[PDB]
Amino acid sequence: GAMNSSNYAELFNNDIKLFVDDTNVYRVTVHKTFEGNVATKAINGCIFTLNPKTGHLFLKIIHTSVWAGQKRLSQLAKAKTAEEVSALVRSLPKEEQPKQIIVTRKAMLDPLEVHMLDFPNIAIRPTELRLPFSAAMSIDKLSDVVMKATEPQMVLFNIYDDWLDRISSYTAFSRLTLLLRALKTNEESAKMILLSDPTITIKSYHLWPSFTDEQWITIESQMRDLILTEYGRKYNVNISALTQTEIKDIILGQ
């Protein structure tokens, strides 16, 4: 049954789970051609597969060669996504295989179910949450590794850096979704907040700055301010009147 804010806590139990986001798999850029026309040109994409409990991000880079001279592309993209997720799962020992895979887009449900027939004990589920994982390509280190790729490959990161030494999975996931939601809402302002010191640095093996515990509280309130103020412009409501469960709903995407 679909994952929503009323049952999403399940993400942090002992049943290994993965989110799969396919929104960055098929990507184009617009460019000027040698005759002076304008055209689209495919660029590398990625499948974003995340364990929200451990932070492990399996970033499968989709090379443009996959698309070359191919028909029915939206069909292929989903097939490609399903193929790769199933191949990852199939490479893991049984004890590392997820119990559930949660797709961020309902369109991914059937293709993944078809490709996961070999895994009867793995539940494929849709979600009501409109999670901001599309904003993964706004994290500079992720964006660069994708763009520099010259062949298919998978790269693994901990998208929580070292946070789990200090905070719970529930807290880390809340922080991540807040950061991604803010990046999705206003990339430029979100990065300005992140670089506000800007002496607080990003370790070479990390995605985010090395903020202290109290510093993260502040960054998080600013990220929250960025999001809510924009929501307020759109809908004409008093931010401060919003309940806790209303604010979460906004961040998570319902």
Both 52 and 150 in one domain: the answer is yes
Asked whether the bond before 198 is cis by omega within 30 degrees of 0, the reply is yes
**Dihedral sign for Cα atoms in the order 166, 190, 5, 46:** negative
Residues 118 and 167 in one domain: no
Both tokens of 115, joined, read 């490709």
Do residues 214 and 96 both lie within one domain?
no
CATH of the domain at 144: 3.30.420.230
Q: Which residue has the tokens 């490709």?
A: 115
Looking at 126, 161, 196, which one is the last position of a domain?
161
12 shares its domain with 123: yes
> Could you give phi then psi for residue 237, rounded to 5 degrees?
-125, 160
Do 38 and 119 touch, CB atoms closer than 8 A? no
In terms of residue numbers, what domain contains 239?
162-254
Residue with tokens 């809908």: 235
Domain edge (last residue) among 161, 182, 201: 161
Label residue 89 left, alpha or beta by phi (over 0 means left) and psi (-120 to 50 means alpha).
alpha
Q: What contacts 54, CB < 8 A, 6 or more positions away?
A: 158, 164, 169
Tell me the structure's resolution in angstroms, rounded to a single decimal: 2.0
> Which residue type sits at 207?
L
Q: How many whole angstroms separate alpha carbon 37 and alpha carbon 22?
A: 30
Q: What is the CATH number of the domain that holds 206?
A: 1.20.80.40
Beta strands in the chain (DSSP E): 17-21, 27-32, 38-43, 45-50, 56-62, 100-103, 123-125, 153-158
Q: Where is the chain broken, named by the residue before each break, C–N > 2.5 Å?
A: none
Of 9, 160, 16, 167, nearest to 93 by C-alpha is 16
Determined by: X-ray
Which of 115, 138, 161 delimits the end of a domain? 161
Q: Locate all alpha helices (DSSP H) within 92-212, ordered by sequence.
A: 109-115, 140-148, 169-185, 187-194
Do the strands 153-158 and 56-62 form a parallel or antiparallel pair, or are they unpaired? antiparallel
Sign of CA dihedral 161, 164, 169, 170: negative
169 in the same domain as 139: no
CA angle at 203 for the pair 152 and 223, rounded to the nearest 5° = 90
Query: What is d(CA 73, CA 59) in angstroms, rounded to the nearest whole number?
Result: 21
d(CA 170, CA 101): 18
Residue 94 is given by DSSP the state G
* DSSP assigned state of 122: P
SS3 at position 116: coil
Number of structural domains (the chain) is: 2
DSSP 27: E
Phi first, then psi, for residue 124 (nearest 5°) are: -95, 125
Burial label, 100 (beta-carbon count in 10 A; 0-12, 13-18, 19+): middle
